[model samples]
Every structure is written in structure tokens, then in C-alpha cells.
Target: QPTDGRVALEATSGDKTWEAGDAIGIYMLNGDATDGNGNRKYTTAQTAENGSFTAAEGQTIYFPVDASQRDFVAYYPYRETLADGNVYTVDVSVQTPQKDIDLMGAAKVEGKDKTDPKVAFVFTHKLVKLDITIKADGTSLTDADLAGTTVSISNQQTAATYNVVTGGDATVTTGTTKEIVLHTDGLKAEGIVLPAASTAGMALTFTVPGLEGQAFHWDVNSAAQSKAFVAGSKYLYTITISKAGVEVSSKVEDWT
Candidate 1:
């Protein structure tokens, strides 16, 4: 996620100073639409610097825009198999006219290759939602020490978002895996969430929202104390089951 390239600016107007919020544009000449197609087209737009735009000579700025897979195929269909392999011709169009200068450059989608396990995770979406329960060992989960505790679930794939709801607590015993339900929302196929009881031998039920009617379960005893779940989609939600904490998990899922 490094800056792809840099664009230099030369003072064209009277004073070549730019304010903090001045807008700039970068245009990428994506080569020919087709090998035989003579008229070349270019995709041009303003540079998105978030907010700060204080301009200076040789001061390279960064932008978050990325070329989509379809954009690559549009210019080079033959070399479109690998979305990250294709090259692009980029240029800058400063709002303040100046001498055009080439900037530093880097490959698109560099080091973002997906793995086999991630692909398999997405494949699980064909099944309905999952219901699961967590227990300590084999004793009923309603022990006096088990109330007002916290539990959490996470997805394996980084790109999937997992939604979990608990059906409160129940009278369950140890040496048994309770059925805790779990589901997924947003957009993803392969999604997995690992649920763990923060306390020792606490019994809890979980439900995955989208996967209602699907058969899935996890054993709390499988892991010693805590477990981490994986989900697709470059982000996951972590919930701290407590009244002091928010009802729903925070929405700030991060890419791995």
C-alpha cells in the first residue's frame, strides 16, 4: 500500500504557491484499448489527498485510489489474467498549470496475492447460516460464577464480516459443546467465526445471522483458553459482551 508514483509541479502562474487544501489531478494513460485500436483514451481525475494539500517542489504525495480489475481488462484483455501483473502509464494534471513531470512509480496490487485457504473459506458461503454453543468442559453453564461474563467471535478470512448474536445463557453442563449460532452479513461467501468464552467453562449460545438453517458448530474446549476466528473481506468485528461495551461490535474491521 505504498504510494504508486509522484508528480512534480513547476510554477506556471504568477506565484507558484499552493494552499493547504488545493486540489490536484492525476491521469493514468492506460495504453491502447486494443492493439489495433489507434485512438488512445486516458482516465484522468483529481488527486485525492484526503484533506491536507500543502504543495511544495519535489514533495511527493500519496493517494488511496486503486485501479480495479475491470480497468485493467479494459486496456489489455490478453494480459488480464493476473489483475496485479499489468502495468499502467500514469501522469499528473495539477489544477495550477505547470511543467509536466513524471513521478515515482510502483506496481499495482503488489504483494496482495490471495491464498488457497482464503479461497476455501469463501467457498463455505453456499451453506446456510451456522448455530453453535460454547461450554467449559461438561458441567452445566449456569454456575453462579458464569453470569455477566464476556465472549467473542472472529472470522478467519480477512475479507468477510461476521455477525453474531447470543440467545442469552442456558443451563448446560460440562463435557458438552453447546450450539452457539453465527451468521454473516454484507458480501462474502467463505466466512468463519471463532467463539471463545472469556471466563473458564462459561456456556453461551451463538448465531450467525445470514447462515440461518445451515449446520455448523464449534467446541469451546477445542482450544485451551482463547480462540481467534477468521473471516474474509479484509476486516472482522470484535465484540466485548458487556453492558459497558456497545450493544453491537464496532465497525472498524481492518485488513490483515
Candidate 2:
């Protein structure tokens, strides 16, 4: 089922799916010095579900003329140009849609030229996701309460260098520390963070509307909590807040 034998591609992100205009970058390496660089950009037009991708106009790619074997690396949220060496710089500071900071890459896939070539990409998240849900302790939380609550995570590495060719071995900049305001909706909020071994003292500051002067601070202080935030993982934090204090619990889930 190839469109004129064009290299067709399909993507999978566990349960999460793809979107229209979700662009991806691909490198088809033949391991030869004279294969004419196989780097190209592809994008999906299938909206709101896992779907197929086609090459950008004027950049359509086809199977090897000799029907030879090749290795490829593909990644989501495409960039027109990669840094010095197939690197994608990650900045988790502004996660407007959350996916803006969600960099994903597919492991090297081997391909052989065919009459109708196709590629199935299994993309994995390259960063960590913090899934936070908040509620009131003694009282019920309303939409207004969540509307006024501003959640921010402090003391996190905001920058990272990702090498897509290596399936994204992310190297976070340790010296850079920045706070991120989680994207909130109703009683939930989410933010992306660079993977780290110890977020022991990392804290979440919640600025509730009624308690403007006194912000609620929840610190990651448990022994296991100290080392929980890792790559390809989603940390779910359930928090309960009251005029008196704040209580919290967390769990880990695969970020697949």
C-alpha cells in the first residue's frame, strides 16, 4: 500500500497517538559514503489518532534503487536543521501544550528497499513527565479553586542536549536551574522535566487565590522520591491542600 512506491511511515506512542501536521525527521543511513545523505523530513496528516506520514513536498523519499539494506533513525516534533551533530536541544521551560517539550525518538529501524516500502516507527518519550492532580482536603475543590491555583516546580534542569541518532541519549545541563509553571486544567496540571537521579529537594509551589501571601510548598523528601524522576517515566503526584497544610502522594508509571 505505497503511494506510488513512496516510503510510507506509521507511528506508535504506546496508547497516545499522533496528530495532523505532527512532523518528524528521519535519517536513512546506508553506511556508505556515497548514498547521497538519506536525511529527510516527514509528517502525518491523520488527525487525532495513530497514523501514517508522508514526506514534505519536494522532499519525497523512495526505496533504494538497488533494493539494498539501510538503517534509519526517526524522531517527532521535527526541526528543519539539527545542531552540529544530529542533536536536538531540549528546553522544558515552556511546555504550553506539554507536547512542545515532549521529545520522542524511535530506535534504529533496518529497512530493505522494496516495490512498496514502509516504515513503522515506535517512538518513545525522551524526557520525564510530571502528572499532578490536586484536590482540597477538608472541602471540595471547585473549578474556581483550580483556576486560581498556580503550580510551579522549582530547582530543575531546564536545558538538555539530545542526540537523535543514538535514540536520544539526553544530556541535561546540570548547572542550569529553572522553575516551570505547569500547564493546568481543571484539577490537574502537567509539566515536562529532564530526567534526573535525585529530585529529593525539588519542590512544588502552589499559589492559591485565597491564600495569596502564603504559597503551599510540597517537597520531594522521601528516600524513594529522591531518586524517582527518570527518563521515559511519568510521575503521578496526587496532592491535597487545605488552609492548614498540604499532603501529597506519588506513583510511577511508564511514559510509554
Candidate 3:
């Protein structure tokens, strides 16, 4: 295709090159394979290594024009593994990333003087990560019945689920013991959304085993456990679970 005057494309992370086996989906909005107002494209099983791949003859590659102009679009996939050692079962799950993946690269010039080699198009993450660390405060919870208890955050609002990348959930349970405990491995649910104010809709609840004559149950909903969720932030729950009742003290923190 060199005779066709074909141009090639490559992956870059500003100054560095994206690894060899990463996926970068591209879509052209106009023009033809070689010329015209090339636009509208899609992705397939495409791979690149050593900083390059042959520019699509028509739809596959193009010399990105400018940063302000929207000539092409791109995206990449990512993943994370969640391990919750705080529970008896030690909840474990895989966070298949990019489900809420949002990215764009404005600079695609191959050269400096308009004729040099510049990296083409690429994408980066735009989603926010929400990690919750729940620590049971024995003193605050000293009055409430806490043995053999399980906790959960309800009424969460999750973003779209894509066929391209999928995710799963885990099961976490705090065993029967007098020891101070940690709730699910950070109740980690990540997406493009924010502050994980999922519990605001239903409130945080604690379920106690044994002693069901009246059914032992507790919740921290109003006047105490409600806050606005923001994107790219972390929340810590210093909770009290006692025979007396359930209460929570919260703090916004950094991604741990």
C-alpha cells in the first residue's frame, strides 16, 4: 500500500508510547479512505506495538488536522482487581474498566513545521473512582448489637454498561466475632459518575444475625449519613454498630 501513498498511525502517551498490546478505537467523521471530508469510522480487533500501525488506507488512518477541530475520535480499555480482606469470606471481584471510559486527544501532529512526524490520535480515562473505607467504631457501636452483622450501601446510580467491556459484583460478609471490623473491600464501585452518594436514596443498613424476636436492624439515613457525591473522590465511614444503635461519622479522602 506504500504505492497508494498510505500513511500509518501509532499510539502515544504524550512523551511516552502506549504499550504494545493496547486497544485504541478510532472513528472518522468525514472524508474518504484517502481524501474528501473523511468522517465516520469504527473499531475491530486492532492492535499496535513499538509505537505504530499502518495508517488506514482510507478509514484506518489519517494525519490529524488540529487540536480544536473534531476530525477524529478515540478510546482505550482498562481494568482493576478488587480484594476485600475486611470480611470473613474476603470479598474479591474484578473491576472491568472502561465501561464508563471517556477520552480524547487534541494533538495529533506528526511534525513541528507541518511536515514532521507527530503522534496521531489516542484516548485516556475520564471516569471518576469512588472508594469507600468503612471501619466499625466499637465505642460508637458499643451500645448496638453488632455480632454476626452484614452491611450494604443501597440506591446506587450506575452509568451505562457496554458490550465492549463488562464488570462483576462480589459478596462480602463480616463474620461473628467481637473484633472491630472493616466493611467490604472499600465498597469500590467506579464509573464516570461521582461521590458515590448511592446510599442517600435508601440509607446505610446493618443486618444482625440471631436475636430476631423483634428482628435486629439498624440504619443511618437522615440528620447523620447523607452527603453529595462528587466525581473522583473517596469517602470513609467511621461507623458505630452497637446494641444501642447504628451511627456514622464520615470524611472525604483521596484515592487510596
Candidate 4:
């Protein structure tokens, strides 16, 4: 019946539909949104043509008036927040598409939207993103040339919640192992902790393959706190790294 062209959920924002491969998870759980595992009746589906997705068989906009056994909710970057929150110290992580990385665009749907099978969620980013572009003055920078390159923003608050509506603090501090790695070639890293003080700086280092194995540290004190990394906003960094040295510039030019 679902393939008969009936869509149970519609994910969109101001006419901009999510990428077709994005995922959505629906859970029918006990009241209180328990921290325990198992969503009494759980289902998963991705947006299809027209920005809609099919639901499990018998998925409906109806719940009995006295149906006290369940509550409904929907989420994106789905399954990352499945951990029970009843316990102290909940660790939440961001989920990005395989082709994409560190884009903090996670969202949840609940209450009224949960009740109606035709749920709609306008997803919002949950973390600050760095749109970086790298070029060289004379050197040909290849993936191999940029190996072992690491990028990080210091002094950030690691304690945050998955609920973007009532999001957590946007502050940060020194480097952690959680620092973003150049893994192959993303050129840019997204999902950085926002700084509360403009004093925080960026550390860019590239390891060289030589007999002695040397590395270059390009440390630039940045005004990241000035960017005020808010969810749903993108900041740009156009930089040139070369033998002369590193020249970096930044501006808020978002395409997301």
C-alpha cells in the first residue's frame, strides 16, 4: 500500500529538500522517551522522489486515545542518539553522509508531528562548519603532499545535547584527541566546537616524508570566537600554503 504513492514523512525546509540519500528513523517507544533500548516498534526509511519516504506496513497517523504503551519520534543522522539518557554522561556524536563529513545537521521530530504519519522536519545544523579552500603559490600540493595534516580549534565545551531546539553551549578550548584528521582528502573539516573567546586559534600542521621525517606547523591565532559558531551557519577560510609561508583569510560565506 505504501508504494501506492502515499508518503508517511516529508522532510523539507523552505522548498529545499534534503539530499536523497539522507536517512530518517522512526521509533514508537514507551512514554518518557526512556533511555532503555528498543523502540517498541521501530522503522527506518530514506527520502525518495518528491522529498518523501515510505513507512513500515500499517504505519499510520492514528494512535488509540488510550494507547498508553507508546510514544512516537523521528530523527536524522539516525541511530547515533539511540543511547539511553537516563544515565549520567551521555556521549553524542555527529553523523554525516559517506561522501560528506562533519556536517552537524542533525534533527528530531516529536509530539504532534509524531502523531501524524505525514511528519515534516526542517533539519538544522547542530555544529559550526569550516568551509576551507587550499591553494599554493608555486608548489603543487597533492593529497600525498598534504599527508598527516591535522586541523583543530582549541577551547570548546564537549558537554552538549542532541536536542538542537534547546542546544548546548558554543564554547571551546585546547586540542583534544577528538581533533579532526585529514583522512585522505576532505580539504575542509566541519563540526568544530564554537569558541566563546575570540582568542582561540587554529593549528595546521603537515608532516613531511623525508629521511628525518620533518613537519611544518602553521599556527595562526584566529578570531573563531568572533565567528560565534552557531548551528546552521557556514564560515569560509581561503588559504594558501607554500614555501613562502601560510596566508590565511576568513569570512562568513555560507551555501548551506
Candidate 5:
């Protein structure tokens, strides 16, 4: 049994590089947590096993996703620390809903003793559009006070790149609901990509990449990262809304 890192094994068969029963060692990188800048680091070392390894040339090692140890926000690359002190990055990705609105656990009006109703409406008609409505019981919303609201949207599908398109921002009052639209187009035919053309939706409540925020609207002013879908292959999408100190989310299937 060789202990050095460069232990060469000979194949038993004639003209064969490494035989099936030849002893070999496997090494991998290990890490514990993500750094402040969101980059993951790892340490490298040799493995303890030194036996007839069956890995073919150019074969890839597989790793499973650990749902219990994953954090959706603040971390781009999902990874797990293995028992051998190795850090394995997960290839799987997630998509959230297109519309999410926090009703602050329900609100009550001063004159009416009824509970205020709130809902997240999503429209997928070539462009992603969403609306968050807050209505009083048995009354129409002609000009309700809805200003300075923010929302967020995310692509649930895991991919190498994403494209997002945003529409104009309009106000909602009595007798009508707010309309925020998002459009996706020109998806990359190859490689890991997010939503694309022919899909419809938008971030109605939060400041997602392809939707309008408190001060910025994608429809009037174009932002590179504000497009609706990523310009690549198939990918998942999730739209969420955060309002009145609450948060809600929804998800859609592959937006091609």
C-alpha cells in the first residue's frame, strides 16, 4: 500500500493502462461554510481507501442535494460538507412562485368591522405579470392607498444563466387591480438557462430583477438584469411579494 500522493498502478491486462484490481487513491476538496463574499473554499487531501478502484477515465463523481442544509437567499452555489472533509457542490436548483404578498396577518378597517382581503394574482400570457390586491369587505377599491410597495421574483430552476424582462408600472385604486407585467424572450438554445419567450409573468409586490421597484420601473427604464427570462435553455421561475412587513411566493414550471 503506497501512502504518497503519486502512487502509480499497473494494469494486469496487456497494453491496458490500469487494471481492474489495481490499488488507487481518491482525493477531494473540503470546506465548512461560505465566506462573506459568498464564495466557497475547500481543502484538498488524499483518501484513506487504497483498493481496486472502478472509476473509468473521464468519469464524474455524483453528489446528492441536502435540503435541510440549504439557504435560498445570500448563497448562490449550494454545497455540502462530506464526512471525509470534502465539500461537494450540489447541481440542483430551485424555483419560487411568481407572486407573493404579505397581508400583515390580515388588516381591519376603522369604520368596517370586517377583515381586509388580500391576494396574489399571476398572469402568464407571453410576459409575466402579477398584481397584489388589498380590498375591504363588501367594498370596491377605486383609489385605495397603495404606494411605496416592493416585491421580489426568482427563477426556481437551477441553470448557468437567466434572462428577465419587466413591463411598465401602473397604479391601482378603487374598481381596478394593479397590473405589473414581465416578459421573457430570446432564450439561449444551449447551456443552462432560465425563462424565455412565450412565457408571461412579473414581480408585482417585490423588487425582483425583471420587475419595478419603489424607485425604478423596468418598462420605462431598461435594466440589463431586469429582463423576464434568461437567454439560454429551459429553466424554472418563482415570483414573490413582500409587503406590510410580510412575504409570500409562488412558482411556475419550465418557461420555454
Candidate 6:
């Protein structure tokens, strides 16, 4: 009772889930240490967040005939121009939608065979995710005002290069730092950033649409905890904006 031969896929992390129309680039290596297929694309079409991925019409890959060993390396939000077939250029500066900036990668399936037909990829975030929530402590600002707010992290490297096959630590490609904006979802603004360095001295700003001047600026180094933003972690900040000043607190958590 033999059946079809198509690789099944699943991706996960500590706190992230698969979304619709998500595609990944995977590299397959034969047991004999030859490139099976490099940068092959796979995709999922499910509307649900926790759905499995599959290959395209003619992009399916099968087990090695020798059955010795098959390995794989994959990265999310696939790009056709992968540097050296493993490195991905990261620009956290353009995160208007934010999803395109959430980069993840994994390497695996040491003793894989056609017997299982399933490959589970545990992707680790190669960048840092920031979740900043803005609120008006009193009644100085309304919900609409928060929606119109623009959030940015200043004095941080906005570009880097990530090697998916090795450790996910991003290498800063540029020498200068700039202000990277975050996508606003109502009062919460979120985005990903290069974690190759620390958030020390980085200033977080919230500029209300019509409020003029500067609304808030919180120096990241002023916090008591570690200032470094490690790769694969999420930095969470709760900010209360009022007529007089802004009060802020911070914490770090795992990014799925």
C-alpha cells in the first residue's frame, strides 16, 4: 500500500504562527553532500494561522534514492536574491506592514526518510521584534489620536545581513544608524529590527499626527534591565502619554 511522495511542512516558534499566503525558501542537500535543490520555494494557502505548507505545482522534492541522509535549510519571507544562497539582506527600515520584516530561518531533518514524509521546521527569529503600546493616562488624548501616532526607534542600525544556515545573529552591513519606524495598529506600534547590537541609547519616539512639536522620547539605556536586544527576542514597552509628560516601562520576552 504505497502512496504519494511529497514533503509535508510545519513551522513554529515560542509565540508565532503561520499566516495566509506565507512562502518560504528551502535548500535541500543530498546525503552524498551535493546540492539537491537550492532556494526552492514552498507556500501555504490556508486562511488559518496554524496551517501547514506545501510545494507548488512542479516544486515538490522527494527523498534521496540512496536513503543515506537528507538535510535542509530554510528561511521565511523568501527572496529570490539570497546572498550566497544563505544570506538574506535585512532592512528593518521599511516596515509599514511589518509582516515582511519578520525574518526567520531553520536547518534540519538529519535522518529523514520517505517513511515519515513530514518535515517540521522550528524557525528562530533572526531579528528583534518591538511591541510598543501607547496610551493616554488621563483624558488628554483619545483613541483616534493614538491611532494617528507614529512610532520610531532612533540611533539604530536599519540594515544587516543574516546567514540562515549558521547562527541567526545578524551582521550589521552599514556603519551608520538611522530612525526605523514601526507599523501602528491602533495604539500599539510593532516592527522588527536588527539585533546585531544593543538598544542602548536608542530613543523611542511617538509623534501624534496633529499634536505638533515632540510628544515623547524614552531613552532605552535609562532602563534597569539589560539594554541589549538579542536576536529572537521581543522587546515590549508600555507607554502612558499625558498632557505633561510620558511614563514608560519595558520588558523582554521570547519572540515566536
TM-scores for the candidates: 0.17, 0.87, 0.42, 0.56, 0.19, 0.85
Clashing pairs in 6: 15-256
Residue 133, candidate 1: C-alpha displacement in angstroms: 13
> In model 5, which runs have C-alpha deviations exceeding 4 angstroms?
1-150, 154-199, 207-228, 231-256
Tens-digit lDDT string for candidate 3 (56-115): 334454444452222333434322221231111121122334332332222232232213
Candidate 1's residue-wise lDDT over 152-240, tens digit each?
23221111111101111111123323322233222111122222223234322333332232222233324332332222112223322
- lDDT of candidate 3 vs native? 0.35
Query: In angstroms, how far off is 249's CA in candidate 6?
Result: 1.5
lDDT of 6 by residue, 5-91 (tens): 444333322113666678888766665343655667778766454556777655566665555456776788888678873778888
lDDT of 2 by residue, 58-125 (tens): 65555576667666678878888888777899888788987667898887777546643566778888
Worst 10 residues of 6 by lDDT: 7-16
Ranking by lDDT: 2, 6, 4, 3, 5, 1
User: Which order, best to worst by TM-score?
Assistant: 2, 6, 4, 3, 5, 1
CA displacement after TM-score superposition, residue 51 of candidate 3 (Å): 9.8
Between candidates 2 and 6, the one scoring higher on TM-score is 2
lDDT of each structure?
0.22, 0.74, 0.35, 0.42, 0.23, 0.72
Candidate 1: misplaced stretches above 4 Å? 1-30, 34-205, 208-233, 240-246, 251-254
lDDT of 2: 0.74
Which tens-of-lDDT digit does each residue in 19-40 have in candidate 4? 5445444444444444233222
What is the per-residue lDDT of model 5 for residues 1-256, given as tens digits with 9 covering 90 to 100?
A: 1244322222111122222332211221123232122212211122222212332343222221221121111111112232132222212122122211100010111111112111111212122223233221222211122233332232223222111111111111122222322322221011122333322343323232222333222221122333444231223322222322222222333322
- Residue 175 shift from truth in candidate 3, angstroms: 35
* Candidate 1 residue 106 C-alpha distance from true site, Å: 11
Candidate 3 has its poorest 10 consecutive residues by lDDT at: 85-94
